[PDB]
Amino acid sequence: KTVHYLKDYQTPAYHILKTDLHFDINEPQTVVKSRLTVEPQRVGEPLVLDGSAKLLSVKINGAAADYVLEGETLTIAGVPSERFTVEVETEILPAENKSLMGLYASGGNLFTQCEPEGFRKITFYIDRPDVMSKFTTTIVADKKRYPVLLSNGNKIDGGEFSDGRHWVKWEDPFSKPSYLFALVAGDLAVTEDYFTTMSGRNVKIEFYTTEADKPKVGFAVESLKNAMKWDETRFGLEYDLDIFMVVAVGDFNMGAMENKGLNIFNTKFVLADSRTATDTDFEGIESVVGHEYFHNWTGNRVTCRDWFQLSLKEGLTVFRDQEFSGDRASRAVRRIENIRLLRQHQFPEDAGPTAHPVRPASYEEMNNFYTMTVYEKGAEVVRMYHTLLGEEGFQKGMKLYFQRHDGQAVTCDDFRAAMADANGINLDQFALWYSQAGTPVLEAEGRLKNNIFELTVKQTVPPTPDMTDKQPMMIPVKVGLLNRNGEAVAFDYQGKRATEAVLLLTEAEQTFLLEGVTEAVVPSLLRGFSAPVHLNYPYSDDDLLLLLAHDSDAFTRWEAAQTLYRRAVAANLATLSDGVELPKHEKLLAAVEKVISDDLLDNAFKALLLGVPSEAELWDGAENIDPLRYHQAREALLDTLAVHFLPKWHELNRQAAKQENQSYEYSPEAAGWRTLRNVCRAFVLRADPAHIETVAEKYGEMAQNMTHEWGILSAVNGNESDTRNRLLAQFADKFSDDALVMDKYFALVGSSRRSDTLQQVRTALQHPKFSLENPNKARSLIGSFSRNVPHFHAEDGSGYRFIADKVIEIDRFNPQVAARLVQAFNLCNKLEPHRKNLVKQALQRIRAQEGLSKDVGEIVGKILD
């Protein structure tokens, strides 16, 4: 089996200077012709082209080449010593392409997806990101069937042919890697707008959607204009073409793609209106539209040397999107949401069998590395430069990065060196953030003696499958101090008297001396989640109530609440285990009452403070896990909270209905009241399931936007009443024509805690609006089921067998989706023996499939072997 290793990187033997492409689209076949201008770098080496499309011909300077094709590689030994041309002709059947990588059909239109290695599914090429070329693309198609013909860059020519056909030619003058190629052909509607760059140049903006979907694109257009302006104001970065196209597609393996000047978006990240999309959905559009635009500099103008460097573009662009969203509105709440995501989804990755560094040292299938570690831990790593350097220093690094590397394909090391060099500091130890996997664990203890608060901190990083030796890392720990009434206490550190400091841990163990401390203190630690680590410090439950009630930092208050909930769940696990009554949780209930009643808290922040960690967070670090015991303990906690405060959940609901004030459109202010209301709805229906019939009676009146419809449906989704099934059927009927709302229906089907979810899911497979071949549908139904703790982890193994069967089926046509799904089994080694045995059986059955993809094989191997 082939493994690719970062240590084996070598510059290409050949460059491609110019890439001329011609697409002749017919029914059913598209013929692609290329003309490649090739420049030897290591003269005399064989020319090796990657490719998997049907090959019709290959020429070297106009003459039939003497070549061999074996597997997905075409090799020509007989090549000239000077510049030469290669012409390839391939044939593609796009409607047969259910992988959604390469050239494929969707909705009767044609789209491409090339990142990372899809271009080689279109033609034979040197399909690696360090080969940058200047592309010109000609497209010829039936004008009635495909009136819209797009590719990267500037449209330089076009015309009509007398048999009903037409053509266009696009020139993209910026040399680029093949992964950023795109082509679209279709009958699509356009929404036009524009932005004027700070140098005074207009940029024509065009969003292409189905005709029916066009009324839902306006928020995405506004978001793009906001993102363009922000990259100018915050980073000094301007767009570089007079045209920026975005195309929505409903069959897409990921959220969006930054193809130069012609971004391609999953509909879920471009279409919204308040009737059909939730506030969270609007927030997502804003994030993703921003993300793809930000890639124009961080990814496109400066690209990746090789795919091991993916985080160079993705960590940095995620950081950029996070900062954009934060600057738009609600920064602290949005930062907590990001940290919560990281801990819920990336920490388990780093603790599991598929753990990898931010910059992996090897891979078998690169599509298995578009992960939370590369993206979200990647962004934390970027954010640490900002914490260490400040905004001004961070911008000095950015400035040198582009000065050095505009137009090049570079590495994570180059980014680090620009930050270091622009600021005149040594960041050599920081490199370990790219090369060492695993979540660092800090053990800290503190002591006020004399007038010094002495904080001792030790760090360790566990072995991961790829590496045992982990050396000490460069870890910024942001700190303050609270007195007995929870106000800030100043202290002295490196000459400055302040109420906050960043303590830079670089050794395995260090002591920090915060001097001049005149009162009894409790430290506030890792403020703003200043490094992506586990911190253990001995806090009493009273210390936690103090932090929650009084700390000035959002993260540390939220962390105090999270810790109180974790301790409460642990207490419930102990009683349920001893067969005794549940704990009183008197102190937790006191703290929650204070939160509910505090009217100075931001409402979205209140909502977060009332969220209990997920089962996966709760069983982090455990062995021999019975997931249903954790689910039982967590549900008992939520039930206690629901019942104990029932009258107050209704009261907060009413206050939020009043403060929303009939403002049903999306805005950040209205959205935070709604977020709060939806937390209250959930608790009300937990305590009083019969309230579902009152809900039903007044549904139409409550259903004023999709945030409310989703909030209600989410709250009743686990209810055993027949009404729950009736409300869901009514939802499916009401929104049957909106594929993105049908995704929500299937997600409710798959996520329900009712006892009958598995057979409802099986029925849903055959719903007329379900398609297994559509990634959004498959993720919503099957994906949700795979994350549905009581059902996926059912003792009988029915959940495991069902998910295994669907990995097997999906893998036949879309290995990417299948390899993401099969990660539901990642907990295997840590499960109690009965479930573990069943998980291993499911994974052996997957392995035993003939023709199993490399994608799924790589993952299964990591879990099993």
Ligand X SMILES: NCc1cccc(C[C@H](CP(=O)(O)[C@@H](N)CCc2ccccc2)C(=O)O)c1
Pattern 313-332, ligand X, x by CB under 6 A: -x---x--x-----------
Of ligand X, Zn ion, none, which one does residue 333 interact with (CB within 5 to 8 Å by kind)? none
Q: Which of 113, 259, 296, 603 binds ligand X (CB under 6 A)?
A: 113
Shortest gap between Cβ of 128 and ligand X (angstroms)? 16
Told to judge if 292 belongs to the known catalytic residues of this protein, a careful annotator would answer yes
Stretch that binds ligand X, among 237-245, 513-521, 781-789, 821-829 (CB under 6 A): 237-245
* Residue 475 found at the interface with ligand X (CB under 6 A): no
The CA-atom distances, in angstroms, between 431 and each of 320, 609, 806 are: 21, 35, 40
**What is the SS3 assignment for 245-263?**
EEEEECCCCCCEECCCCEE
CB of 298 to Zn ion, least distance (A): 9
Q: Do residues 308 and 360 lie in contact, with contact meaning Cβ atoms separated by under 8 Å? A: yes
Q: In sequence order, what are the beta bridge partners of 456?
A: 445, 511
Per CB under 6 A, 809 contacts ligand X: no
Q: Does 660 bind ligand X (CB under 6 A)?
A: no
Query: How many of the other CB atoms lie within 10 Å of CB of 445?
Result: 13
| Surface-to-core class of residue 798, CB atoms within 10 Å of its CB (0-12 exposed, 13-18 middle, 19+ buried) | middle
Question: DSSP assignment of 617-654, as one string?
Answer: HHTTT-SSB-HHHHHHHHHHHHHHHHHHTHHHHHHHHH
**Which C-beta is closer to ligand X: that of 664 or that of 813?**
813
Sequence-distant (6+) residues with CB within 8 A of 769 are: 732, 736, 739, 742, 745, 777
201, 484, 726, 734: residue in contact with ligand X (rule CB under 6 A): 201
Q: Which stretch binds ligand X (CB under 6 A): 32-40, 247-255, 511-519, 663-671?
A: 247-255
Backbone angles phi, psi at 140, to 5 degrees: -130, 125
Rg (CA), the chain: 28
Closest approach of ligand X to the CB of residue 665, in Å: 23
Q: How far is the CB of 253 from Zn ion (least distance, A)?
A: 13
Q: Which stretch binds ligand X (CB under 6 A): 67-75, 291-299, 818-826, 832-840?
A: 291-299
Q: Establish if 649 lies at the interface with ligand X (CB under 6 A).
A: no
The minimum distance between CB 21 and ligand X, in angstroms, equals 18
Work out which of 254, 481, 591, 680 binds ligand X, going by CB under 6 A: 254
Dihedral sign, Cα of residue 630, residue 634, residue 637, residue 639: negative
CB of 203: closest distance to ligand X in angstroms? 5
Q: How far apart, in Å, are the Cα atoms of 754 and each of 90, 689, 788, 789? A: 52, 13, 11, 12
Residue 152 is encoded by which pair of tokens?
A: 């990267």
Residue 690's CB is within 10 A of a number of other CB atoms, namely 12
From candidates 253, 354, 705, 853, binder to ligand X by CB under 6 A: 253
174 binds, among Zn ion, ligand X, none (CB under 5 to 8 A by kind): ligand X
- The answer to whether the beta carbons of residues 341 and 373 sit under 8 Å apart is no
Does 393 bind ligand X (CB under 6 A)? Our answer is no
407 counts as binding ligand X under rule CB under 6 A? yes
Which amino acid belongs to residue 764?
Answer: A
Distance CA 390, CA 232 (A): 19
Q: How far apart are CA 856 and CA 315, in angstroms?
A: 25
Assess 365 for contact with ligand X (CB under 6 A). no
Nearest to 89 by CA among 31, 37, 50: 31
* Nearest distance, CB of residue 398 and Zn ion, angstroms: 17
Q: Which does 36 bind (CB under 5 to 8 A by kind): ligand X, Zn ion, none?
A: none
Sheet holding 534-536, edge to edge: 509-514, 452-460, 441-449, 534-536
CA distance 179 to 533: 34
Q: Which does 698 bind (CB under 5 to 8 A by kind): ligand X, Zn ion, none?
A: none
Pick 294 or 385: Cβ nearer Zn ion: 294
Please tell me the count of residues contacting ligand X according to CB under 6 A.
29
Of the pair 228, 473, the CB lying nearest ligand X is at 228
User: Is residue 159 exposed (0-12), middle (13-18) or buried (19+ Cβ within 10 Å)?
Assistant: exposed
| Neighbour tally for 714: CB within 10 Å | 18
Among 72, 91, 240, 651, binds ligand X (CB under 6 A): 240
Cβ 321 to Zn ion, closest distance in Å?
A: 8
DSSP-based three-state secondary structure for 656: helix
- For residue 530, give the nearest of 508, 553, 511 by alpha carbon: 553
The verdict on 257 binding ligand X (CB under 6 A) reads: yes
Cβ proximity to ligand X, 270 vs 318, nearer residue: 318
Q: Does 223 bind ligand X (CB under 6 A)?
A: no
Nearest by Cα to 367 from 4, 720, 627: 4
Choosing from 151, 191, 287, 826, the residue that interacts with ligand X (CB under 6 A) is 287
Among 50, 258, 365, 811, binds ligand X (CB under 6 A): 258
Binds 430, which of Zn ion, ligand X, none (CB < 5 to 8 A, cut-off by type)?
none
Which one among 39, 45, 96, 242 touches ligand X, defined by CB under 6 A? 242
Please tell me whether residue 349 binds ligand X under the rule CB under 6 A. Answer: no
**Which one of the spans 66-74, 286-294, 411-419, 581-589 is the region binding ligand X (CB under 6 A)?**
286-294
> Which of the following is catalytic: 115, 286, 292, 709?
292
As given in the structure block, the two tokens for residue 88 are 């390839």
Residue (318 or 712) nearer to ligand X, CB: 318
CB–CB of 829/836 below 8 Å? yes
Closest distance between ligand X and the C-beta of residue 231, in Å? Answer: 13
| Residues of the shown chain interacting with Zn ion in the complex, contacts defined by CB under 5 A | 314, 317
Output the smallest distance, CB 184 to ligand X, in A.
15
Question: Judged by CB under 6 A, does residue 241 bind ligand X?
Answer: yes
Judged by beta carbon distances under 5 to 8 A according to partner kind, the member of ligand X, Zn ion, none in contact with residue 287 is: ligand X
Q: Could you give the count of Cα atoms lying within 13 Å of 591 in the half-sphere of its Cβ?
A: 25
Closest to ligand X by CB, 788 vs 814, is: 814
255 binds, among ligand X, Zn ion, none (CB under 5 to 8 A by kind): ligand X
Q: Strands 202-209 and 243-249, how do they pair?
A: parallel
Q: Find the shortest distance in angstroms from Cβ 263 to Zn ion.
A: 10
Q: Each residue of 579-591: b (16+ CB within 10 Å) or e? A: eeeebebeebeeb
Catalytic residues: 292
The residues binding ligand X (CB under 6 A) are: 113, 115, 154, 173-174, 197, 201, 203, 239-242, 253-258, 287-288, 291-292, 295, 314, 318, 321, 370, 406-407
